[PDB]
Amino acid sequence: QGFLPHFQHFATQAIHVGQGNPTRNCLEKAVAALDGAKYCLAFASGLAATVTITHLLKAGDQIICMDDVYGGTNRYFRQVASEFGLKISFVDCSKIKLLEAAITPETKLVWIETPTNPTQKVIDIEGCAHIVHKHGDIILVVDNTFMSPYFQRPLALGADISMYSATKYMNGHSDVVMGLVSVNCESLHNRLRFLQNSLGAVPSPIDCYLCNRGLKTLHVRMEKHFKNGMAVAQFLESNPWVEKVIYPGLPSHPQHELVKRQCTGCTGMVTFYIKGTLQHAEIFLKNLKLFTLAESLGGFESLAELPAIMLGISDTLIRLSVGLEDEEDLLEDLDQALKAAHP
Template sequence: MSTQEHRNKSGFETRAIHAGYEPDPTTGAVIPPIYATSTYKQDGVGGLRGGYEYSRSANPTRTAFEGAIAALEEGERGFAFASGLAAEDTLIRALCRPGQHAVIPDDAYGGTFRLFDKVEKVWGLDHSPAAVSDPEAVRAAVRPGETKLVWVETPTNPLLNIADIEALASVAHEAGALLVVDNTFASPYLQQPLTLGADVVVHSTTKYVGGHSDVVGGALVVRDLELAEQITFHQNSMGAVAGPFDSFLAHRGLKTLAVRMDRHCDNAERLVAFLQAHPAVSQVIYPGLPEHPGHDVAARQMRRYGGMLSFRVAGGEAKALDVCARAEVFTLGESLGGVESLIEHPGRMTHASVAGTELEVPADLIRLSVGIESAEDLIADLERALS
């Protein structure tokens, strides 16, 4: 067994540090260099060094990151893209054809809904929303002979519903469809969907993978090599690849993912307890709560419950907007998964694209991406904002 194969079979934290790259044989560099090159010298016509000819097709910095995220998701191949939506679009075009159909979450991320509803639908791919927390609802939404993808987020964004990945894999496969799991909220540290029967994992690597709010990117991971070849062709043909510097930053983020996620979870649990006791809060939504309808499934398929939480406030939309405006340690902003805590109003911000549709989110909902600051400071900030 090679050193890399041994590392790929090691614990998560060890793989996060070492998978995807061996120290450079020439210099001994322990971190992958940023290969800022567009093309590569060939040793004669067709004589490629390491398979590299043009950096849209492959780049060594990107290759290292793709290998690392594949190892952490326990997949066979990883693919890095310029954004999470670029990864999603490439996957859809690789696997689907006009006239086919997809099932999507009935509380999907607004950008994913927009992609399916405003881009892929025009191209000819139809879709049906379904409650991914209910396997029978997903089964009812499947169209025999037409459904190609069952697309789920777990936890969902922003209502934090939980999908039973094993159950939905059975539903999808019985219909001849593939199960795609957006694992952005959980990250590979908390959940590995491929080990539970999923066919493809999607990430916005902008979020927990990068972890520092300094890079935009996306990734796909698959376990089937034939499927990998289809994605390889479309990744190169469509060209929305991650650049070398973006790949470097995302790979750097993977190395500290485990320790960051534990702190995100610790802080989120402290805030959940605080918010549950606050009189201005009408509901706290977090999979770690025993009363959460998906708690038992989350306990079975996740290591911990994550750094994302949502809550509803008494006083409706006006109060929710006021809380967002008054927060100071929490930064008012979109995105999630960085070391800094963010607060947002989904109905006006990340999920504005679903306003007026069956996916519309409650107007009194606030979403928190809990960072790794002092939990005491975060609690004090929310106390001020809610008062």
């Protein structure tokens, strides 16, 4: 039904394209294609990618970041801004109007992450692109990490840089770290390349090989994360013991319509509020038998978490990371622990 039609040739390119030196170039060639980008640059980590992006700016320039309220980031950026001598301004871009405002004559970069973690507020990338590009020379960067190039393609939505940061967690707990920066601009790529080779925040031939190896199945893995995610999200929202569910894949989401015109699907990241108190989120989490209590997100295994203990996030909110297990089993495990949290 509804989402942007999946990007053509993704799977074909992910498998055939290209099949630092050789290893890195091939990885980049292939990632460039999946991002619909003309160019790509690989870094040791998503963070190193981020730093390098900012090295693009000169002392004094202002950088406006999406405000990661409950999430972790923000301390970073702020530290990268401090050193290097830059001005950082965090603005909730959930409201396009707010971004229009914050734009200062010094603003040379706008960094956005969508969905957000763990509330999952979808930012209108296209909206921000037009607002940002409207005046002066400024860069729009989208951190596609939470969606992956398979479900979201920033560059196509007006972004100037689509950054993909993969941790030691997705292709199985495959300990491959990587910072992928894609772009179409000519100079942007040139400047970024120089930095890449000048500073050395680069990946090893092994990482590149492993990373590339894992991409081949990104499409089949992500589709299942989505089928399982959707299923879990529905079951929950229809469960008597769940106050609310937040999953970009459901129509109940406050941005479901923005989601269908920007993504081709959703991750296995499902958030939901459990009816009751922090004492109930407790019973629940402790009763899960198939889901695993972990603070990370991405494996083949379904993970659960209570951010409140892992004005603060409602201690009744739970973020799930639906993996590749059997949909039936996942639901039964959720059902069983919900019934336990309410005798």
